[PDB]
């Protein structure tokens with residue numbers, strides 16, 4: 001493992017220090033349909049005319065990004081994305097900007113979100129959840145190895161590719177940091193106690209998120225939910241969790257150590273780092289090497305109805321894409 | 337059941353991120 005990571009670090013570094021820019025243009029893409037929306041942007045299926053390929057184009061409104069004070073976060077996302085490379089991270093193929101927007105063109109994953117499949121099915125069996133969780137485990141070991149904190153693990157940010165494997169999306173909160181950070185960021189149900197308390201935190205909040213993910217995948221609902229955020233934060237810090245009766249003893253053990261409010265005992269943040277996770281009973285049947293290569297049998301294959309098929313995605317109201325005659329936030333996004 | 341409570345809650349849909 002140390003071998004692979006060492007070289008992965010060398011490649012990321014070169015790209016990090018010399019990020020690619022303006023590698024495409026809006027008019028080289030055919031706007032097909034909206035696959036999702038966010039506070040300051042949207043993602044659409046697009047078709048690259050020269051190659052006939054489909055991609056997921058993320059369009060960010062520079063003015064909204066500024067109003068929401070996510071300028072640096074948006075710069076973090078593209079800079080990081082153009083530099084990383086892992087089998088469970090969706091690839092940033094092209095990036096560019098125009099008068100009104102920033103654009104990040106990623107590889108399209110027709111399979112759809114884990115969220116959709118998870119909600120419809122209810123809950124995943126333990127081997128099913130173990131297969132996806134394992135992929136997140138290698139992805140986090142990879143990211144943290146590069147001094148990156150992800151900060152938004154959740155089913156809504158996980159896609160299922162043609163091979164049944166996971167593809168992580170949304171690096172809007174990713175950040176390269178050695179040492180503590182304080183930005184309050186994430187999703188209510190997945191926030192670690194440190195974040196809600198405003199106490200400076202590290203990569204350990206990613207490992208706590210994994211604990212929330214595994215629990216939600218195996219139970220059908222998150223360990224901490226309520227109709228309003230403040231109620232959800234009250235549960236998270238209380239250091240009190242309840243487990244469904246069908247949760248194996250090993251599964252409950254792994255989660256007790258993951259959903260540890262005391263980030264001095266929390267698995268992943270210990271002296272043995274990620275190994276305390278990879279070597280936990282619940283993962284004894286897991287062949288970490290096999291999972292990376294993807295030679296492990298996937299429990300679910302979301303067969304699609306052809307390339308460019310958006311059947312596995314929900315519908316969203318279509319928004320017209322306009323580009324003003326004037327440049328809006330040049331200085332702010334000069335390095336994009 | 338907790339499953340029932342969850343499904344009846346307002347947080348079964350896509351959850352938005354927070355920051356400000």
Ligand SMILES: N[C@H](COc1cncc(-c2ccc3cnccc3c2)c1)CC1C=Nc2ccccc21
Pocket residue numbers: 035036037038039040041042043056058059090106107108109110156157159169170171172
């Ligand atoms: N967090 C949600 C999804 O976020 C994504 C963010 N960036 C890229 C993809 C993303 C990446 C690759 C993909 C490949 N195939 C299909 C869909 C894909 C979606 C998904 C909503 C959300 C929050 N901020 C947003 C900003 C814009 C759109 C949606 C949101």
